[PDB]
Design an enzyme around this catalytic site. Sequence first.
Site, PDB file in Angstrom:
ATOM      1  N   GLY C 136       0.805  -1.212   0.000  1.00 45.15           N
ATOM      2  CA  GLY C 136       0.000   0.000   0.000  1.00 45.15           C
ATOM      3  C   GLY C 136       0.838   1.261   0.000  1.00 45.15           C
ATOM      4  O   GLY C 136       0.566   2.202  -0.750  1.00 45.15           O
ATOM      5  N   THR C 137       1.868   1.302   0.846  1.00 44.23           N
ATOM      6  CA  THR C 137       2.742   2.470   0.903  1.00 44.23           C
ATOM      7  C   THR C 137       3.437   2.697  -0.432  1.00 44.23           C
ATOM      8  O   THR C 137       3.274   3.746  -1.063  1.00 44.23           O
ATOM      9  CB  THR C 137       3.772   2.297   2.019  1.00 44.23           C
ATOM     10  OG1 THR C 137       4.370   0.998   1.919  1.00 44.23           O
ATOM     11  CG2 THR C 137       3.118   2.444   3.381  1.00 44.23           C
ATOM     12  N   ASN C 198      12.072 -10.357  -6.735  1.00 41.25           N
ATOM     13  CA  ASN C 198      12.750 -10.965  -5.598  1.00 41.25           C
ATOM     14  C   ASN C 198      13.143 -12.403  -5.891  1.00 41.25           C
ATOM     15  O   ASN C 198      14.219 -12.845  -5.487  1.00 41.25           O
ATOM     16  CB  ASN C 198      11.859 -10.897  -4.359  1.00 41.25           C
ATOM     17  CG  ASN C 198      11.815  -9.516  -3.750  1.00 41.25           C
ATOM     18  OD1 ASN C 198      12.507  -8.605  -4.200  1.00 41.25           O
ATOM     19  ND2 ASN C 198      11.002  -9.352  -2.714  1.00 41.25           N
ATOM     20  N   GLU C 246      19.916  10.189 -22.264  1.00 41.57           N
ATOM     21  CA  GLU C 246      20.244   9.263 -23.340  1.00 41.57           C
ATOM     22  C   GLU C 246      19.667   7.873 -23.118  1.00 41.57           C
ATOM     23  O   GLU C 246      19.463   7.142 -24.095  1.00 41.57           O
ATOM     24  CB  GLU C 246      21.758   9.166 -23.515  1.00 41.57           C
ATOM     25  CG  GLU C 246      22.429  10.501 -23.741  1.00 41.57           C
ATOM     26  CD  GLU C 246      23.812  10.369 -24.338  1.00 41.57           C
ATOM     27  OE1 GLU C 246      24.670   9.707 -23.718  1.00 41.57           O
ATOM     28  OE2 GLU C 246      24.046  10.934 -25.428  1.00 41.57           O
TER      29      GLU C 246
HETATM   30  N1  LIG Z   1      13.790  -6.659  -3.200  1.00 38.42           N
HETATM   31  C1  LIG Z   1      13.339  -6.309  -2.003  1.00 38.42           C
HETATM   32  N2  LIG Z   1      11.982  -6.239  -1.776  1.00 38.42           N
HETATM   33  C2  LIG Z   1      11.513  -5.888  -0.558  1.00 38.42           C
HETATM   34  C3  LIG Z   1      12.389  -5.592   0.470  1.00 38.42           C
HETATM   35  N3  LIG Z   1      11.660  -5.274   1.559  1.00 38.42           N
HETATM   36  C4  LIG Z   1      10.351  -5.359   1.241  1.00 38.42           C
HETATM   37  N4  LIG Z   1      10.243  -5.749  -0.065  1.00 38.42           N
HETATM   38  C5  LIG Z   1       8.997  -5.937  -0.827  1.00 38.42           C
HETATM   39  O1  LIG Z   1       8.153  -4.836  -0.551  1.00 38.42           O
HETATM   40  C6  LIG Z   1       6.803  -5.238  -0.467  1.00 38.42           C
HETATM   41  C7  LIG Z   1       6.058  -4.404   0.572  1.00 38.42           C
HETATM   42  O2  LIG Z   1       6.745  -3.199   0.818  1.00 38.42           O
HETATM   43  P1  LIG Z   1       6.019  -1.970   1.561  1.00 38.42           P
HETATM   44  O3  LIG Z   1       4.745  -1.585   0.861  1.00 38.42           O
HETATM   45  O4  LIG Z   1       6.966  -0.802   1.608  1.00 38.42           O
HETATM   46  O5  LIG Z   1       5.725  -2.460   3.066  1.00 38.42           O
HETATM   47  P2  LIG Z   1       5.332  -1.378   4.194  1.00 38.42           P
HETATM   48  O6  LIG Z   1       6.435  -0.386   4.462  1.00 38.42           O
HETATM   49  O7  LIG Z   1       4.909  -2.080   5.461  1.00 38.42           O
HETATM   50  O8  LIG Z   1       4.064  -0.651   3.535  1.00 38.42           O
HETATM   51  P3  LIG Z   1       2.706  -1.476   3.312  1.00 38.42           P
HETATM   52  O9  LIG Z   1       3.022  -2.948   3.342  1.00 38.42           O
HETATM   53  O10 LIG Z   1       2.111  -1.106   1.982  1.00 38.42           O
HETATM   54  O11 LIG Z   1       1.725  -1.145   4.406  1.00 38.42           O
HETATM   55  C8  LIG Z   1       6.830  -6.712  -0.113  1.00 38.42           C
HETATM   56  O12 LIG Z   1       5.913  -7.408  -0.921  1.00 38.42           O
HETATM   57  C9  LIG Z   1       8.237  -7.183  -0.415  1.00 38.42           C
HETATM   58  O13 LIG Z   1       8.203  -8.103  -1.476  1.00 38.42           O
HETATM   59  C10 LIG Z   1      13.755  -5.661   0.249  1.00 38.42           C
HETATM   60  O14 LIG Z   1      14.539  -5.400   1.156  1.00 38.42           O
HETATM   61  N5  LIG Z   1      14.228  -6.020  -0.991  1.00 38.42           N
HETATM   62  N1  LIG Z   2      37.650   8.535 -33.138  1.00 32.94           N
HETATM   63  C1  LIG Z   2      36.937   8.811 -32.022  1.00 32.94           C
HETATM   64  N2  LIG Z   2      35.612   8.529 -32.019  1.00 32.94           N
HETATM   65  C2  LIG Z   2      34.852   8.783 -30.932  1.00 32.94           C
HETATM   66  C3  LIG Z   2      35.489   9.372 -29.751  1.00 32.94           C
HETATM   67  N3  LIG Z   2      34.525   9.519 -28.827  1.00 32.94           N
HETATM   68  C4  LIG Z   2      33.368   9.069 -29.372  1.00 32.94           C
HETATM   69  N4  LIG Z   2      33.567   8.621 -30.622  1.00 32.94           N
HETATM   70  C5  LIG Z   2      32.527   8.069 -31.519  1.00 32.94           C
HETATM   71  O1  LIG Z   2      31.725   9.135 -32.021  1.00 32.94           O
HETATM   72  C6  LIG Z   2      30.362   8.730 -32.094  1.00 32.94           C
HETATM   73  C7  LIG Z   2      29.455   9.917 -31.806  1.00 32.94           C
HETATM   74  O2  LIG Z   2      29.582  10.336 -30.452  1.00 32.94           O
HETATM   75  P1  LIG Z   2      29.586  11.911 -30.129  1.00 32.94           P
HETATM   76  O3  LIG Z   2      29.224  12.708 -31.354  1.00 32.94           O
HETATM   77  O4  LIG Z   2      30.931  12.338 -29.602  1.00 32.94           O
HETATM   78  O5  LIG Z   2      28.464  12.083 -28.996  1.00 32.94           O
HETATM   79  P2  LIG Z   2      27.846  13.541 -28.728  1.00 32.94           P
HETATM   80  O6  LIG Z   2      28.958  14.482 -28.341  1.00 32.94           O
HETATM   81  O7  LIG Z   2      26.827  13.464 -27.617  1.00 32.94           O
HETATM   82  O8  LIG Z   2      27.178  14.043 -29.983  1.00 32.94           O
HETATM   83  C8  LIG Z   2      30.192   7.615 -31.082  1.00 32.94           C
HETATM   84  O9  LIG Z   2      29.460   6.548 -31.685  1.00 32.94           O
HETATM   85  C9  LIG Z   2      31.595   7.159 -30.743  1.00 32.94           C
HETATM   86  O10 LIG Z   2      31.776   5.807 -31.168  1.00 32.94           O
HETATM   87  C10 LIG Z   2      36.939   9.648 -29.832  1.00 32.94           C
HETATM   88  O11 LIG Z   2      37.551  10.148 -28.865  1.00 32.94           O
HETATM   89  N5  LIG Z   2      37.573   9.350 -30.968  1.00 32.94           N
END
Ligand SMILES: Nc1nc2c(ncn2[C@@H]2O[C@H](COP(=O)(O)OP(=O)(O)OP(=O)(O)O)[C@@H](O)[C@H]2O)c(=O)[nH]1
Ligand SMILES: Nc1nc2c(ncn2[C@@H]2O[C@H](COP(=O)(O)OP(=O)(O)O)[C@@H](O)[C@H]2O)c(=O)[nH]1
Lengths: 128, 431, 430, 303
Positions: C136-137, C198, C246
């Site tokens: 619920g939370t 889980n 991205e």
């Molecule tokens: N992966 C993971 N899941 C968790 C963990 N702790 C709780 N859960 C999951 O969280 C679900 C419930 O979480 P919550 O809703 O936050 O429990 P709560 O804080 O008592 O709030 P309410 O149960 O809704 O009243 C459970 O079904 C668990 O499966 C954790 O440490 N790891």
């Molecule tokens: N030759 C060369 N290629 C690069 C380098 N860095 C990135 N690239 C290539 O350039 C392509 C385009 O990336 P870029 O234009 O730099 O990203 P943007 O700056 O967010 O537009 C990527 O697919 C990379 O594989 C570099 O230092 N040298």
Amino acid sequence: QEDTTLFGYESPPDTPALHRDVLKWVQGLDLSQSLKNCRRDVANGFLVAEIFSRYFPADIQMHSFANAASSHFKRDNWTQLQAFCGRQGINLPGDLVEGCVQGVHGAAIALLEHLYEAFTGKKVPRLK
Amino acid sequence: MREIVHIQGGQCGNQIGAKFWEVVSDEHGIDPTGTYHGDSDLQLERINVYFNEATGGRYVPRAILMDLEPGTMDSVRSGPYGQIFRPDNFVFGQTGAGNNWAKGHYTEGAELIDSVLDVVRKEAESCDCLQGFQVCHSLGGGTGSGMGTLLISKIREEYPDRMMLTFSVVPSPKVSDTVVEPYNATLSVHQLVENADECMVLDNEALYDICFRTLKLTTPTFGDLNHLISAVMSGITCCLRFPGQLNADLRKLAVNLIPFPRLHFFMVGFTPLTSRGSQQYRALTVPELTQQMWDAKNMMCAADPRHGRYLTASALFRGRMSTKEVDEQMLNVQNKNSSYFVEWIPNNVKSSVCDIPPKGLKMSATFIGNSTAIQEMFKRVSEQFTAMFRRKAFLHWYTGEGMDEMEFTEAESNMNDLVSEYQQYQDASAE
Amino acid sequence: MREVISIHIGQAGIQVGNACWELYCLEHGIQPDGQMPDDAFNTFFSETGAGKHVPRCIFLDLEPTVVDEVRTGTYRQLFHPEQLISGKEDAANNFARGHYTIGKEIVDLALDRIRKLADNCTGLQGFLVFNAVGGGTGSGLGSLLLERLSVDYGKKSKLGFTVYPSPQVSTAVVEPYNSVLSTHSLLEHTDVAVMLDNEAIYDICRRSLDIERPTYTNLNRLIAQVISSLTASLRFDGALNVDITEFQTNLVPYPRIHFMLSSYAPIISAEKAYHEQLSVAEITNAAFEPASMMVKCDPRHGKYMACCLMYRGDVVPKDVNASVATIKTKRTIQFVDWCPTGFKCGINYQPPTVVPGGDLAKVQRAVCMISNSTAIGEIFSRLDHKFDLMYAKRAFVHWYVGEGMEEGEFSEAREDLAALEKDFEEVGAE
Amino acid sequence: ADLEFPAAPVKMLSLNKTFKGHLLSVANLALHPTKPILVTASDDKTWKMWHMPGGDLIMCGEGHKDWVAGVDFHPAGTCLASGGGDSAVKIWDFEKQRCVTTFTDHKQAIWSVRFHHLGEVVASGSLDHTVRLWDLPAGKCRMALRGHVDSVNDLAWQPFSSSLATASSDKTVSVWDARAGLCTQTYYGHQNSCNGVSFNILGTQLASTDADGVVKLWDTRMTAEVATINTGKHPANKSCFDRSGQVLAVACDDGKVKAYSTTDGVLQAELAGHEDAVQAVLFDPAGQYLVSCGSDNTFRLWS
Ligand SMILES: Nc1nc2c(ncn2[C@@H]2O[C@H](COP(=O)(O)OP(=O)(O)OP(=O)(O)O)[C@@H](O)[C@H]2O)c(=O)[nH]1
Ligand SMILES: Nc1nc2c(ncn2[C@@H]2O[C@H](COP(=O)(O)OP(=O)(O)O)[C@@H](O)[C@H]2O)c(=O)[nH]1
């Protein structure tokens, strides 16, 4: 609720590609730029400034306008154009201006249509 | 006195540019603090092509770094030669383009582009005479490809007559880094075809192949690939910076290389690339340089010239050499491989010679080949773009930046027409 | 500049946050007192004038016990006391209790603290919401919080590291109910949702770590290592940097399809460590192994759409390229026809730090593979019959109705999960 | 060649009635070479094939998403090519009454569409600054002509030749080779956007209009400016030569179809039937009558 998106992708709407009368009027007007794509070409506001200069050369100059892609420069161009339109009496609606600066589909088309109305002797383009 | 404005775009472009500027400063005897320590007059003779003299003895590169995220520029500034660049030439944003050409070209590249053009114009007007601009960047990345294409369009608009050179790192054929590389490359090639006067295609997989097979390195980082790219980038303009027995500038190379305006894509290679083991085994001669030059393995492009036909090829040699040797070698290459050369051009070679070889090498040579082989590379990129675009995968990310779906198909059409032109001149017959 | 706001909702959220923040403190050298003896911590910690670092995290729960355990344990001088938000009454496994009646004031205070946190961040890469679908939370309050965040913050990238119920093993009875409700809620708000099970992590611990009695601490430590690998590119420099923004561009093909399988490699105890080479190709293969998946969902049933690989440590691009080429040539690994590349490789020069007291060994290399694949629809298919089996009798439905819900909510959630099933089938099909 | 068809009468007024069968204005006209049948391409997203002597609506083709700007007949009348503002060039079959195929490589409004004299390739000139050739058997854009910095307003194949003259809004008239894909010639002189361009039947002369009303006539063989007719300030739209005749009929936005003599640039007739403007004019293959379409939503027959 039946949705048309492809897994959440809504394709952009298709523009009506202006009108022959408006496009030919723009072409006959001597402009530095060309209306390849209306959205991109009008969003900056330079071509509209050129149109306004061709119709009112005395008080609209190109040196005040800059063909610059930044939002600041686009706003500057459109706001000085809006101020001139307010002085002259031309509408130039603000919603169309904002849609044009944001690149909203059809806003530039509507703005060009309205300019064609205001300039070309209130010649309403026939439509069904 | 013919100046060149260098621009670096994106992470890959910035790394390549940093390596290139390190190499050029090494060639001209400039330490990372900017002072001249070369002890050679020819090094300072034409230093103004790339550098400007500061108030003191410092020389600053005429380089402009653009990016949307500051990390790559922080790394570049902290690199060994990071302090030569003027700090004002680092133009960076705050939110990087997520491999999105739309983000780097329309939404986020638009605001930074005016700062970039301010820097570019400031650097350009300082030039006495301007040969042109060279932009190094990578196709297939957000900020690099997007803002590079945007800046190239703007500079073409401002200076149509000035030369434009591009070093584009095309996404690799076999192993692709990011998913959206075909999209970014498709949108970037469309801009380069219309705007860039001269374009040099590099592939990271071709670079890995050459450094694994010729250099025979075991752990090639990106530094080595950037080193080879820097070698070619220097060697293309060494005829400007150094006296030559038969000198040839960038515009001469473009005139002799480009038959028709749209066919301006070139594959490049550098010689002599020798493994450290075989350095003593190889003998440095003009025939050896030509042999490695015309080897398809030496091409830093993925496409191999064998499949296509050489429209043109420029060979810029460096070193004290025989013009008879060079000319005879290129003539024998053409005569032996006439099947791979276009028939309706009497001579497919622009041979240039420079008297100053790169440091450490007695001789060197850079090769710039305009051949219809690049057709297959564009064809492969289109084969990926069409597959992705048919189902419109990841298209919403570009759409949310406000670019028309029709723009993608327009870029694809431009690529297909370019491929058609390359095939047309591949199978064109004389008379 | 690269700040990320961490939210931990419910017992599971807080217990995985304990491991995550212990791991971050160990990685960045921050002592539990709050200060360490640059600016790589800014993603997770905000430094004060005194030099003491406070995490940009928020521990949200309607039960006082879990939060008081943090307030009493070692990390009492680290966290912000008001950032630890404690309720008075537990949600008692009731989604309605956590979403309509008790969660209101708590979520209001949570949004208040979230505004205060975001005001201290120059940039903001996004939110990391760690909750437990099946309580619920976690489900109800977490769903409400995600809805509020979507309404007010807008386009900030919210990455939800959710834990769905395991196929067969479980700890609750109304878990299908509140899981279906929360899945309905989060289908439309989170940007990238990472599935965790889980049972799958128990299997990973039993097989790879040789732990015959895996426990929640071990599960949380594995999850913490995975999130640290995910965020490593924000904090440490390396070749092929990958960003939170991205992730969505290279992993989300369409807005509805953003659920992701996560797999870490290697998972080896120190006794088994330095007994195998642990090369890049081998760790990539291990990451792509179905058993290494942290979700009980066989990828062989479906087809991969995208795979983001995050390499940590001594990894070279040549090796990542060779491994990915082998993966592409591999036949059992199957990709969708419309995604030819389908790979987003990103390397980092920071090796994964080892938590003292953990079972993981000190390995110089690591891979975190987060994949979008259509096989993930199978888990929704399991919950879709586990739900309707109880819903036919309207068992435990009075509990949910009593806190101001309607049969229409259950019907809408079931219909939306069916629609998600249909969407997964459609993306899988040609 | 060496076949003189005398067409003197140009001062004759309207003979047939003003056929108003289009809701909106008609943008272009295309006459069938064999039968006296005219397809009118109006901006109502439809084209209409009419039997003119009867004035009867033989067919109506619809399907263009936007206004249709140009239309042309295939040789032997096998198919109809329609280019419109929807950036799609559509080939329609008369027999099965539907669109055979659609080409969408053009991303902007298709100003003009023409067939080859042999008819297998179709040249489409659009706002996208390019002139794309479509190989109908291939269904693919084999070649694209580039070099116009403004919109390619018109497109006219040289009669029985691979040369193709396009008048563009960049004040230029460029003659290209289809087979090579190169600009053989570029006529300058216009001080405004070139609305239209047309060849003589013999191919000796090429006339291009301007937005200021000036119609410039060049000698294709001589590549020289022979004549410069200055009409009213209104745009000169589209023009058509008289078949083996010395009279060029030019439309106008003044509503008057004027007829200037190519020999001297002197007005001969000024038909004033159209109320507002004339989009295009066309001569009969036999030379019996003119047809003029304009903003009056009506295509009118003359002489
Ligand atoms: N992966 C993971 N899941 C968790 C963990 N702790 C709780 N859960 C999951 O969280 C679900 C419930 O979480 P919550 O809703 O936050 O429990 P709560 O804080 O008592 O709030 P309410 O149960 O809704 O009243 C459970 O079904 C668990 O499966 C954790 O440490 N790891
Ligand atoms: N030759 C060369 N290629 C690069 C380098 N860095 C990135 N690239 C290539 O350039 C392509 C385009 O990336 P870029 O234009 O730099 O990203 P943007 O700056 O967010 O537009 C990527 O697919 C990379 O594989 C570099 O230092 N040298």
